[PDB]
């Protein structure tokens, strides 16, 4: 009954993935050994969405861990919750991809990918009715980006009628940790445009801003950043995992949020978010959550929503709440902020409510916005790509892996077209 298959590719993908798994096990009352020690029958009712049931009262993540480097795998296995994963679901190379999309997509990744495919087929067979796939990775490196994209293509070919979801961490110029990021992102974005049904644009810069400005966190770590992403991930599939008053799964969300096939790039947000000191001076109420969610400072993509228009927003609420209140607050936001919503889609907001709140909170919210302002993210990337490509800088490496210049030209064109399309509907 509606199983999701999880895939983690490259370092970032793996680490965020681990965080996601940790949170989800806690949520469903699963301990580091795979045993259920929860309180409520609701925690086990839909356990099969994310876990396969093994012999002797144990649960194992329907998760595939992929990397061209074994170090990441080792790190995962040695982590808290590392032992819950199926040993046969770790699919690793020995070499690494050296921040080269071509190595990940055409060379080393190509050699690797068949094992992964074999694993995932088995994982699909195991599930009674697989609704689809969730891939966590980055677009700026070689494995997550090149290998990941390749894997996606393969998956879609074999499962063309299933939902294909990605949580893609994009490279920003402020927090620019690598040189060839523009290339890797450009190449991967293109592929994503044709083969994913929904893509959550996660930005490290935005995460840092959230941590520093909102969470008041003097020294955020990648772990802390990852936590935010994990929360967001949990939010989307809450309706699949628990009961509720109004329920929307992955498909329902896509259908309401994607009016044209290409426009499936979301700016996610999560509410509430408070400092430890500033927690006592707040109201645990729906109007507050709503206020938080639509704010630009709470979006996980480095784009100003006020620089574009919202095509659609999907809001997913967790906790015991008044439907009327939710409906009033959502109507208020669209009436007051009329100018930030496209006028040819009346009721730009879709609402879903799950009765089970996350741990530690009485209420929570997850926001998925499809904004034309996401073009900003792509534009910057394009610019950076141009800056390098105009001089054919670092191209030789990619060509050594069998790539031609023409592919670069194509990808760039494609991305530009996508950008244009978004602009068109923005008006």
């Amino acid at each position: 009954m509606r199983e999701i298959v999880h895939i983690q590719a490259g370092q970032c993908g793996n680490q965020i993935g681990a965080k996601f798994w940790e949170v989800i096990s806690d949520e469903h009352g699963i301990d580091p050994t795979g045993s259920y020690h929860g309180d409520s029958d609701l925690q086990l009712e839909r356990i099969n969405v994310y876990y396969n049931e093994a012999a002797g009262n144990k649960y194992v993540p329907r998760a595939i861990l992929v990397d061209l480097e074994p170090g990441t795998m080792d790190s995962v296995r040695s982590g808290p919750f590392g032992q819950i994963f199926r040993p046969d679901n770790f699919v690793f190379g020995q070499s690494g991809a050296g921040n080269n999309w071509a190595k990940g997509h055409y060379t080393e990744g190509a050699e690797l990918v068949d094992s992964v495919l074999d694993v995932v087929r088995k994982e699909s067979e195991s599930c009674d009715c697989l609704q689809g796939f969730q891939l966590t990775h980055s677009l700026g490196g070689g494995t997550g980006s090149g290998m990941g994209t390749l894997l996606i293509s393969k998956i879609r070919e074999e499962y063309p009628d299933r939902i294909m979801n990605t949580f893609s961490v994009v490279p920003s110029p402020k927090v620019s940790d690598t040189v060839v990021e523009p290339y890797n992102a450009t190449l991967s974005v293109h592929q994503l445009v044709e083969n994913t049904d929904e893509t959550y644009c996660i930005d490290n810069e935005a995460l840092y801003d959230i941590c520093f400005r909102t969470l008041k966190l003097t020294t955020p770590t990648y772990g802390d950043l990852n936590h935010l992403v994990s929360a967001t991930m949990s939010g989307v599939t809450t309706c699949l995992r628990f009961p509720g008053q109004l329920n929307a799964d992955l498909r329902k969300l896509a259908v309401n949020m994607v009016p044209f096939p290409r426009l499936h790039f979301f700016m996610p947000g999560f509410a509430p978010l408070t400092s430890r000191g500033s927690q006592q001076y707040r109201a645990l109420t729906v109007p507050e959550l709503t206020q938080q969610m639509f704010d630009a400072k709470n979006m996980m993509a480095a784009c100003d929503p006020r620089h574009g228009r919202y095509l659609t927003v999907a809001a997913v609420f967790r906790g015991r709440m008044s439907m009327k209140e939710v409906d009033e607050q959502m109507l208020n936001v669209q009436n007051k902020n009329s100018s930030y919503f496209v006028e040819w889609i009346p009721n730009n907001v879709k609402t879903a409510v799950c009765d089970i709140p996350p741990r530690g909170l009485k209420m929570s919210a997850t926001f998925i916005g499809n904004s034309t302002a996401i073009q900003e993210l792509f534009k910057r990337i394009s610019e950076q790509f141009t800056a390098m490509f105009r001089r054919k800088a670092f191209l030789h490496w990619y060509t050594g892996e069998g790539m031609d210049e023409m592919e670069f030209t194509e990808a760039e064109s494609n991305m530009n077209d996508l950008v244009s399309e978004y602009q068109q509907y923005q008006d």
Binding site: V255, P259, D327
Partner: protein
């Protein structure tokens, strides 16, 4: 005899149905396990000894909502085979409901319905509960209604529908679903009671003094209306109205089968003590726009027929007086082709109230079902909404993917335009 079969489709339909079945149980003294420590037979089959089973089928394309019923308080009330569930929902897509996903489950549900109907010896007809906006509530129900119409033919079908609001809309694609279901609703339904969540919310806040009304509050209220409709079959009083009778009185032309329901009095325990809720008063309150179940202005429309269904400590004479008073009120206008527009029912049983409910216990209540041209306004706004989105073909591709054709949309819109025009025509004086 005189049985009515209830069909509850999709989330909304299921949840309303739960409330309804809670209410029926309380009314007939049936416990949540089917035991009763007669008229109840209109809603319940009886098996062996100390067991009563609802004459109902619950259907959803996803398991979640029905699964609650299976786990929950009334798990023993229904036999498992009457609670029908698929694996994947219609995802707010009419096409998925009517074709792709619905074609897998429809036969099964029909078979079960037939089995249920074979057990009943005086079938009055069907009560169908569903939303207009959801993919299952629209697409599946439409399909189901067609099949029922084919198989059973001249049996009366009554559908209670959660029609989408002007402002307070929860999904984006609602107007599409609403338009598509309406087309089929026209030909296969005998009487359709539209209801609007926004209106219910207003009522709950204004009349019941509830800060934050949730769906559970709405559903309970909705169930009461159904009870009023079926009380004439489930009990007996001074003046009685069967379903066929009701149809005869309330429906002047085949297509014009969209009465608005309104219930009175809806009051709090403390607020009611002070009020002297007389027959005249409640009747007067029925014809006021603020207590309506659909957002729209009757003052801007004309009445064609009203059924007034009274229950509890009521006598004919005072009902007559109330009717007379209503006649003399200039702001309530009736069409010239209806010299008397009142069908009146009076039943002896006072409305029973659900423990922990929002409504206070009253000696008398009334449910008015009135066919007014004013409801056409709702259709106008919905049509307008549809027209914008369709101008850009927004979301259309999805529907096409699941086997729907673009021409169907246009056809549906045309049908609704024609219906609105028909409604306009009946209005005008000669």
């Amino acid at each position: 005899m005189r049985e009515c079969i209830s069909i509850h489709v999709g989330q909304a339909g299921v949840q309303i149905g739960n409330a309804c079945w809670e209410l029926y149980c309380l009314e007939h003294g049936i416990q949540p396990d089917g035991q009763m420590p007669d008229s109840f037979n209109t809603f319940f089959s009886e098996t062996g000894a100390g067991k009563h089973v609802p004459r109902a089928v619950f259907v959803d394309l996803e398991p979640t909502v029905i699964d609650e019923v299976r786990t929950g308080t009334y798990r023993q009330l229904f036999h498992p085979e009457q609670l029908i569930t698929g694996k994947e929902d219609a995802a707010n897509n009419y096409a998925r409901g009517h074709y792709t996903i619905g074609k897998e489950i429809i036969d099964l549900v029909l078979d079960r319905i037939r089995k249920l109907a074979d057990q009943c010896t005086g079938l009055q007809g069907f009560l169908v509960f569903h939303s207009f906006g959801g993919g299952t509530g629209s697409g599946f129900t439409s399909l189901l209604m067609e099949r029922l119409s084919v198989d059973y033919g001249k049996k009366s079908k009554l559908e209670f529908s959660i029609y989408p609001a002007p402002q307070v809309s929860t999904a984006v694609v609602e107007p599409y679903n609403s338009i598509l279901t309406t087309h089929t609703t026209l030909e296969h339904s005998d009487c359709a009671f539209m209801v609007d969540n926004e209106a219910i919310y207003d009522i709950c806040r204004r009349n019941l003094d509830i800060e934050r009304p949730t769906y559970t509050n709405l559903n309970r209220l909705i169930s009461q209306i159904v009870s009023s409709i079926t009380a004439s079959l489930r009990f007996d009083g001074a003046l009685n109205v069967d379903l066929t009778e009701f149809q005869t009185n309330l429906v002047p032309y085949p297509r014009i089968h969209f009465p608005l329901a309104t219930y009175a009095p809806v009051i709090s325990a403390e607020k009611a003590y002070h009020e002297q809720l007389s027959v005249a008063e409640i009747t007067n309150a029925c014809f006021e726009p603020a207590n309506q179940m659909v957002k729209c202005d009757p003052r801007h429309g004309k009445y064609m027929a009203c059924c007034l269904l009274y229950r509890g400590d009521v006598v004919p004479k005072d009902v007559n007086a109330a009717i007379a008073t209503i006649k003399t009120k200039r702001s309530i206008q009736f069409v010239d082709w209806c010299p008397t527009g009142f069908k009146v029912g009076i039943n002896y049983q006072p409305p029973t109230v659900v423990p922990g409910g929002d409504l206070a216990k009253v000696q008398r209540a009334v449910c008015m079902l009135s066919n007014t041209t004013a409801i056409a306004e709702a259709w106008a706004r919905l049509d307008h909404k549809f027209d914008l989105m369709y101008a850009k073909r927004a979301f259309v591709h999805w529907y096409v993917g699941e086997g729907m054709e673009e021409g169907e949309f246009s056809e549906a819109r045309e049908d609704m335009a024609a219906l609105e025009k028909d409604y306009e025509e009946v209005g005008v004086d000669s």
